[PDB]
Amino acid sequence: GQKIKGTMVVMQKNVLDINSITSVALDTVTFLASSISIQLISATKADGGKGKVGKATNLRGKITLPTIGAKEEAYDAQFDWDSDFGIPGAFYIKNYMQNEFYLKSLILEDIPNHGTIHFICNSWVYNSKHYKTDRIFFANNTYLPSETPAPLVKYREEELKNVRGDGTGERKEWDRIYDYDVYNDLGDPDKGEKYARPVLGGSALPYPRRGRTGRGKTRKDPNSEKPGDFVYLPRDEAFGHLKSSDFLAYGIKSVAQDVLPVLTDAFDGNLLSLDFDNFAEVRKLYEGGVTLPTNFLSNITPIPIIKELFRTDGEQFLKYPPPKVMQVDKSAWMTDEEFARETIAGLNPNVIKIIEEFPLSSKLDTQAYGDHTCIITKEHLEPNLGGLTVEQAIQNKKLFILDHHDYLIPYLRKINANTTKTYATRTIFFLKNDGTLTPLAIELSKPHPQGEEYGPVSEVYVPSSEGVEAYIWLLAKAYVVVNDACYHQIISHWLNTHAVVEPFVIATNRHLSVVHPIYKLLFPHYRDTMNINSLARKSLVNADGIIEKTFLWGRYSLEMSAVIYKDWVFTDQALPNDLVKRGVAVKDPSAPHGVRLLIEDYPYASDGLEIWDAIKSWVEEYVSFYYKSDEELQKDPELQAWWKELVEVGHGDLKDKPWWQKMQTREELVEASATLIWIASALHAAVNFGQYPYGGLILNRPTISRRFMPEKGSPEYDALAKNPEKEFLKTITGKKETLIDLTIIEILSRHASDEFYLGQRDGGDYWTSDAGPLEAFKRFGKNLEEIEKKLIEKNNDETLRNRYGPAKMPYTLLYPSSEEGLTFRGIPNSISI
């Protein structure tokens, strides 16, 4: 059997690059007798206990397959083999070109007595000289460890060592070394000792690990990593995009680095007035944009990813879309039904919980802070429409808190010590008999000037519809949104999804071979996570980044994630566990998902549960194809090393916590897997894709509070009485930070046209050999089609008002699919923004 037809498909560097090529470039084109060489490794025949490798073969072709793909080149080789080489199930490759190419696949056809073999690569191959060992790629055969080809056990073992790479050295672009390190690269201690931030990782501050980058330490701090112009992530975790509009992390680097300078100059040099006057000025943002004169612009130029990214037509511009929560009822945002609806069906839809006892305690110590008990008590909780006692309403599963109190208090002196004036809130909600919630009171806690020990200085507030007191209710509500928007951005979003998924991406690539059942299960749920977190570490959660300067906890934000993380339990992220812990549901096996929801028209948890079991059934089906027993899941060395390093290093600051699955069990594997995918896919989508639709109007979702509350016939109070729009505007997020906020969260809410949503979407039809899982993944994808149909139904039911509101905004967030753009819908597989 003479020649086996290999035919390789690839994408060139200039095609997945934001700048490279013209027309005629860095298009790298005429390939022949060396440019690329391939050796075939044997699955069947050995030399020792290692498959035969067979003769460097040049890529003697270059034309059409003819359905190759958009901007994909395909090569061809005729490999001279026989039979005593055996069947190939792996290959080594060498790039002799200057440029790297994106290798997609290699199909091995016309192999005698055997079928056409598939290699799914989706990896870049840089020049041969960058590598000690040449690139190895296995065929699409899923193999548990004690299921490897005996010529291939040593290449599989060898390949996982090279991805692991020792814990030394400064990492390069072309590398694929997954290793961990603490968050010690957020500060810039050398260019001022005020930009120095603490390490998030270890004894003192618990946190997950980030990808190791190995740059040099700082001059002033030997235990903190210097900044870099390039932040490293394992090469294949940074995805290119065939289209320029889809480099959204690049458009967010370019906000932080490029747009922000211009704004800083325009405000400073007064090309722009520093603060908004009416609420009609704020709405014009979305009606005509941020304008600036020709001469200023033609000098401070260009930043072209803010292209038809913001579609800034002509000139004298920057441009925002009208947010959905303002598209149809412009003032819907003021209404207490929209204020409370958004707790259940908004931007940050999972903080709220049941009230178990009353008064309402403080879980912080009295010798150091005091009596931080809630002063929302009994009197003001019995209103217009509220026949029950507080004691009947908790009895009846009708009274709810939004506690933004105790995590805030130790950090509040510190938060308020400069340009930001704020409270540590608490907010009681009543589930009205109509299925909707409403606010019954807000205690605003202020620090207390005679020390932390005689604090707080609390003030309760209740609904109002009269004169000036209307606006005091509004400002009381904004001091709660302010508290929540930064609990969102940081905890519900950065820590709970982005930050805690990183150790999973790293632990899977280091201990679970690219050929493993479970590597391939998890794998599509990691798409661009390491890339958006490396740019978040460089341009968003850094000393003076967009998150500190735009959101309330400021310089203390990420230090606060570490302490809130002291309480992060992985088990409770699973959506049943979550609901059951907050008390907005109970385990009722008679009920549809095995849980009865106490707030029954809670749109996030209602659609959520539908998507949770859709994920959990598939990973259970999948896992069953590969483990017929708990005792053979235990018998897997890679999997047990995956979970061992994950819980011990990855999230090692909680490594001795009692809730960690110990992976002795197939159901332990199934919930561990499903929780992860939930976090990566649906949770993240729930808390992220509704950021510009809801918080794209600072009125509706204010990020910073600059003044405190007007008291009683105060000059502040009479100024608010005179014109209340302006004093409100003076309390919340002022213009400059409104603009940087808005530009980030708009990009952050966009779906790239090349996005991979849950279902149907992985990389290739032949990502595995196994026919069972392939068809079990089309059924899971059909299942989501069906579930979307049930969700589309609940948004035509005009009975469920919580999924519409004063805002008239059908809660489209957990709809598993979507078109590109800034839809209020779609569930990607992963944290891709």
Chain contacts with Fe ion (rule: CB under 5 A) = 688, 833
The verdict on whether residue 498 carries a ligand-binding annotation is yes
State which residue, 184 or 681, has the beta carbon closest to Fe ion: 681
In order, the DSSP letters of 487-511 are HIIIIIIIIIIIIHHHHHHHHHHHH
Q: Are 355 and 440 in contact (CB under 8 A)?
A: no
Q: What 3-state DSSP class applies to 75?
A: strand
Q: Which residues pair with 424 in a beta bridge?
A: 445
Name which of 158, 159, 156 is nearest 146 in CA terms: 156
CB of 752 to Fe ion, least distance (A): 13
Q: What is the dihedral of CA 693, 697, 700, 702, to 10 degrees?
A: 120
State the amino acid at position 277 in one-letter form: D
| Least Cβ distance, residue 833 to Fe ion (angstroms) | 5
Choose between 144 and 252: whose C-beta lies nearer to Fe ion.
252
Catalytic site includes residue 448: no
Q: Where are the alpha helices (DSSP H) in 732-770?
A: 735-747
What's at 676, amino acid-wise?
Answer: L
Min dist CB 748 to Fe ion, Å, is 6
Q: Is 355 or 680 the residue whose CB approaches Fe ion more closely?
A: 680
From the candidates 684, 745, 802, 827, give the one annotated as an active-site residue. Answer: 684
Helix axes 153-164, 500-511, angle to 10 degrees: 140
Which of 688, 700, 802, 829 is the catalytic position? 688
Distance between CA atoms of 212 and 170, rounded to whole angstroms?
Answer: 9
Say which of 498, 516, 651, 751 is annotated catalytic: 498
Tokens standing for 767?
A: 């990502």
| Least Cβ distance, residue 831 to Fe ion (angstroms) | 6
User: 343-352: b or e for each residue (b if 16 or more CB lie within 10 Å)?
Assistant: bbbbbbbbbb
Whole-number minimum distance, CB 608 to Fe ion, in Å?
17
Catalytic choice (241, 488, 493, 651): 493
Residue with tokens 């699409």: 140
- 498 classed as catalytic: yes
Of 92 and 487, CB closest to Fe ion: 487
Query: Does 493 participate in catalysis according to the annotation?
Result: yes
Is 599 annotated as belonging to a binding site? no
Task: For Fe ion, give the closer residue by CB, 210 or 511.
Answer: 210
- Per-residue DSSP letter, 116: P
Query: Binding residue per annotation — 833?
Result: yes
614 or 685: CB nearest Fe ion: 685
Beta-carbon count within 10 A of 467 CB: 10
- DSSP assignment letter at 270: T
Whether 684 is catalytic is yes
Q: State both tokens at 314.
A: 């002509």
Cβ 85 to Fe ion shortest distance, Å: 48
Q: Is 394 annotated as a binding residue?
A: no
CB atoms under 10 Å from CB of 797, counted, come to 11
Report H helices in 402-453.
Answer: 412-416
Q: What angle do CA 170, 172, 174 make, to 5 degrees?
A: 155
Residue of 479, 274, 467, 453 whose CA lies nearest to 370? 453
Strands 36-46 and 88-95: antiparallel
Q: Angle CA(342)–CA(345)–CA(351) in degrees, nearest 5?
A: 75
CB of 465 to Fe ion, least distance (A): 38
Q: How far is it, in rounded angstroms, from Cα 351 to Cα 292?
A: 40
Q: Residue 199 or residue 833: which is nearer to Fe ion going by CB?
A: 833
Q: Which residue is nearest to Fe ion (CB)?
A: 688
Annotated binding site for Fe(3+): 493, 498, 684, 833
Active site positions, annotated? 493, 498, 684, 688, 833
